Design a protein around this nucleic acid. Structure first.
Lengths: 124, 180, 262
RNA sequence: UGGUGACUCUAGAUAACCUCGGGCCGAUCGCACGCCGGCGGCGACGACCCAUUCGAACGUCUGCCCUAUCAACUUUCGAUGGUAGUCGCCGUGCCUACCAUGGUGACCACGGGUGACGGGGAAUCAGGGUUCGAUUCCGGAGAGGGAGCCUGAGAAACGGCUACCACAUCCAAGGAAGGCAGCAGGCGCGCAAAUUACCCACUCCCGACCCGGGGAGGUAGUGACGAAAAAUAACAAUACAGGACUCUUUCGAGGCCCUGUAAUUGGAAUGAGUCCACUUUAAAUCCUUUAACGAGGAUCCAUUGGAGGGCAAGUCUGGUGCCAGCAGCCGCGGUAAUUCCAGCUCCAAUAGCGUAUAUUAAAGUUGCUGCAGUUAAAAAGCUCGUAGUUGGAUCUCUCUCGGCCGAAGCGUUUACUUUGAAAAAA
RNA sequence: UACCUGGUUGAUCCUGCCAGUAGCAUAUGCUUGUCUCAAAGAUUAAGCCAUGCAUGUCUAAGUACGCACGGCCGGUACAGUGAAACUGCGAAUGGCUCAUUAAAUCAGUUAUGGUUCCUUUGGUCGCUCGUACUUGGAUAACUGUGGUAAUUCU
């Protein structure tokens, strides 16, 4: 067969400007559908652009029948960029995290703790 | 402090006398008849039966109209008839003490696959269930100890992807076809 | 041991919050406020666990800092704000108003009220005292002080408060025959008409309450909250009308509903 | 005025006082428009006082392991009480002055011991119990040992300070600087315990704060502490074996069912593994999902203890010959060793099994339930006697205002029993 | 599952203990294919610690004449972003360990009418009879001159 999408626990959250739902994906003989194809399917189902649709947490049931995950369709892309976790934005190429590791930041902070004034900017 | 849970329990009891001849013979009879792997499966079913018997025995000392006796005994009886161990005609607390270990061993998915004819022998049934060939309703079940409820007995099919029921030959058949 | 504590362990959190045991070590320690720590519901619990508008506490913060939440007519931006009994939670963005009424299992039920009923609340008065050149003050269970109350309002009565002004509009005396809800103890959340009050000087008075179905229970005097005058409540009751069902009756009702509808 | 069971409460009134180290009545900031030199709406921040929100502190009642080879203890070093004060946030011998001579104890005071932090709880347990609880929840205490403090609402704080004691660091010898019983990691100790990893995505906490931070916490690495599920084969044809809930003058047809070191043969099934794309997730850090390859000695080879009894299973064979060794106990071994060293075979549990120690049941061998004391261990030489323990019969709607109860009260008290309230979760 | 068995004797019945038997918790030995949950320097040394990290924090709304960036007219008092520094808050929570501790801690009960309370929340906040269209002096950050082998010294 082909991939089927259903949206179980649909809810309209006006407080975060979105619609949040549970997505069931029927792929009876395929690997777990990539999040992008599910996003295109949801965009077709809800008559919107697939750039305001964030899906995550997809678990495939034992035996290979279906997959269950969560999805959220935002009112616009700016509302998405405002209400979204930064990692789900980075999964769409809309956000880039810092490069430094925790260790570098912590040691740099402790190094600046040992100087006073503008010399703090001269550490690191 | 961790967000984890340490709740766990053992599901069997090791017998007091390790080398009782009659006990060994009976346990081997059960293992051979139901195709179990070791004595721990026999002891596990024994432990569940013993706990059910203990609950029933405690509830039989209460007054026949004690609300806790009514609620808990009705729940226990409904559970026992749900998995088909107890006939719904015999739904008194005193009939719980009449159940044997083989009534609980009969409801295993291995035994049910053997009985419904999907397998030629009980060991064949075990290897079938363990090899993702048997599904209950729409769920592939790999666990031979799966206790089948009464409402689930009618739906034990042969899986929709198994070579025996779904229509895709296995590795051996495909390789032999590729040989010629 | 030195100074106040600021954390609340998940297993040490009140049971009526219905929190998990695997979602982190900690629970939202409610901020100080009108209601006690164990007799409240933090806004994060209400928004995320009950209404499920937010999946995480960060989304609760995102909701609250948009000023979409009001409690008793005031916009509250603290996600651990303790909202307690009788409190009115207004969400004008979604146009819905809730009142925190105990469920019969002693838990805060998600109870929806009309916008007309969100304009007021009931408050159990905790003390009356004259102070500051003869001005009489009244302190309720919200820890809110009202000057110049009606002279007939005494302790343990119930006053109706207009939230916009905060002034008393009416009151019910704590008298035999007035409807009351139990706010503490084993009988928490139960609603019935007061039938007796056995006074124990120097100790806790015991109030006997008769439920609408005839069941009779008792509580301490500090656990009674008069709802209305006579059998008529002054607020809309939750899905259950305060009538506790025995576990057998609950099981029978669930089975009958399953058979009837599915 | 008001309140409590109860105030020397709250409120009111009068004569005054008000700390040089006097206290309240805003010289503060942002955003929008607005009408005469006007009057303003919405917030942010900051005082004072009142209001158990969060607490803290200090009291009541009951409950705490062993020990008499600890029977008297405390009263100069306040011991118990009274009066006045000091100090303290307050009650109080908390301290001081004076007065009294008290206070505790076989119903175990005082002293000693504790591989003693207390509790929720854990193991075991027919009923009764016996042991354990450093350990993630609550309470306490400490931050090398003592002691003293600063700041502050809150600390006698130690990822704060001051000093001494012990240890130890850099020194240009003038000085300076320490505190892992936080997370990793190292040494030492020992029978005995993991990575100097990733991240604030979750749970929450802190801050001026929607934004920053968090070795709290999460996530992985090591992991046979432990717990759950669960492979190491299934089927068929073919010797043969037996029965025969099948047919016949023993006979035999035994595919009419079920076994069987048959390394027989035959095709099917599949995951351990290697690999790909997803999915997972803060980051593929597994599980799940799809796909490729992946079993005949399916060498893709299950082990740990045993075979006289207790106790399941060989007085089979070879070796040793009271030796070596086995053996928890009884015992085996000095030329057929059922017991040692081995081969074969067998059985017990099985991804687990053996051993040492502590502990529970067994132990009705600590006995309350529930043991014993003529002779097996044991009744004091005998009598008196205070605590202690036990103690014969009997004795058959409580008054009110409001004379339908909407409504009363003091009925000798306790134990006991039933009920009700209150009583963290895990 | 309210259970026993071997061992004193030539043999017997006992007392009685030893030994066996099952769980549990530490250590250890041999062995280990899959998968889930999970304990883990407690015991002896509350013994000693190299190194790194573990507590910091700014909104429209305390103080911005750091071009360190910055433009819109730029002798517009202050466009704006913003390190530093002063100010405020927190650092008394959390985490660790179990040394001390035997009516002590702790548990249940009750009390504070015998006290303290940052913060939150609700009130009071022109109640006082005698330049205000806004007062005073420092001080940081910044510039510049140094001292000590050495410090988060100054």
């Amino acid at each position: 067969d082909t991939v089927t999408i259903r949206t179980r626990k649909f809810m309209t959250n006006r407080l975060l400007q979105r619609k949040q739902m549970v997505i069931d994906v029927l792929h009876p003989g395929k690997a777990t559908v990539p999040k992008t194809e599910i996003r295109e399917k949801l965009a077709k189902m809800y008559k919107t652009t697939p750039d305001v649709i964030f899906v995550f947490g997809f678990r495939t049931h034992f035996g290979g029948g279906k997959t269950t995950g969560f999805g959220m369709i935002y009112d616009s892309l700016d509302y998405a960029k405002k209400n979204e976790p930064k990692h789900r934005l980075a999964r769409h190429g809309l956000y880039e995290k810092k490069k430094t590791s925790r260790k570098q930041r912590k040691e740099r902070k402790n190094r600046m703790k040992k100087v006073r004034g503008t010399a703090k900017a001269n550490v690191g | 402090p961790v967000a984890r849970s340490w709740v766990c329990r053992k599901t069997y009891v090791t017998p007091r006398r390790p080398f009782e001849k009659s006990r060994l013979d009976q346990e081997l009879k059960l293992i051979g008849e139901y195709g179990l792997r070791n004595k721990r499966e026999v002891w596990r079913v024994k432990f569940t039966l013993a706990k059910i018997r203990k609950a029933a025995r405690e509830l039989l000392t209460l007054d026949e109209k004690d609300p806790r006796r009514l609620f808990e005994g009705n729940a226990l009886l409904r559970r026992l008839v749900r998995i088909g161990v107890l006939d719904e005609g015999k739904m008194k607390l005193d009939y719980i003490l009449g159940l044997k270990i083989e009534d609980f061993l009969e409801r295993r998915l291995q035994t049910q696959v053997f009985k419904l004819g999907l397998a030629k022998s009980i060991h064949h049934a075990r290897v079938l269930i363990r090899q993702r060939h048997i599904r209950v309703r729409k769920q592939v079940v790999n666990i031979p100890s799966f206790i089948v409820r009464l409402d689930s007995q009618k739906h034990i099919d042969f899986s929709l992807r198994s070579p025996y029921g779904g229509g895709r030959p296995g590795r051996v058949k495909r390789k032999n076809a590729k040989k010629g | 041991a030195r100074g106040p504590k600021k954390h609340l362990k998940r297993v040490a959190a009140p049971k009526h919050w219905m929190l998990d045991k695997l979602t982190g070590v900690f629970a939202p320690r409610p901020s100080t406020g009108p209601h006690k720590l164990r007799e409240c519901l933090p806004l994060i619990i209400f928004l995320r666990n009950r209404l499920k508008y937010a999946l995480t506490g960060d989304e609760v913060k995102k909701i609250c800092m948009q000023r979409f939440i009001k409690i008793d007519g005031k916009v509250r931006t603290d996600i651990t704000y303790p909202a307690g009994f009788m409190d009115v939670i207004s969400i004008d963005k979604t146009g819905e108003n809730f009142r925190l009424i105990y469920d019969t299992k002693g838990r805060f039920a998600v109870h929806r009220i009309t916008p007309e009923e969100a304009k007021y609340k009931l408050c159990k008065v905790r003390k009356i005292f004259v102070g500051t050149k003869g001005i009489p003050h009244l302190v309720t269970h919200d820890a809110r002080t009202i000057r110049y109350p009606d002279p007939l309002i005494k302790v343990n009565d119930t006053i109706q408060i207009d939230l916009e002004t905060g002034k008393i509009t009416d009151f019910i005396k704590f008298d035999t025959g007035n409807l009351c809800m139990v706010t503490g103890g084993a009988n928490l959340g139960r609603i019935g008409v007061i039938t007796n009050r056995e006074r124990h000087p120097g100790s806790f008075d015991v109030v006997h309450v008769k439920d609408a179905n005839g069941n009779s229970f008792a509580t301490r005097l500090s656990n009674i909250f008069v709802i209305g005058k006579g059998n008529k409540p002054w607020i809309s009751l939750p899905r259950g009308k305060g009538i506790r069902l025995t576990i057998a009756e609950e099981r029978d009702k669930r089975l009958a509903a399953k058979q009837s509808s599915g």
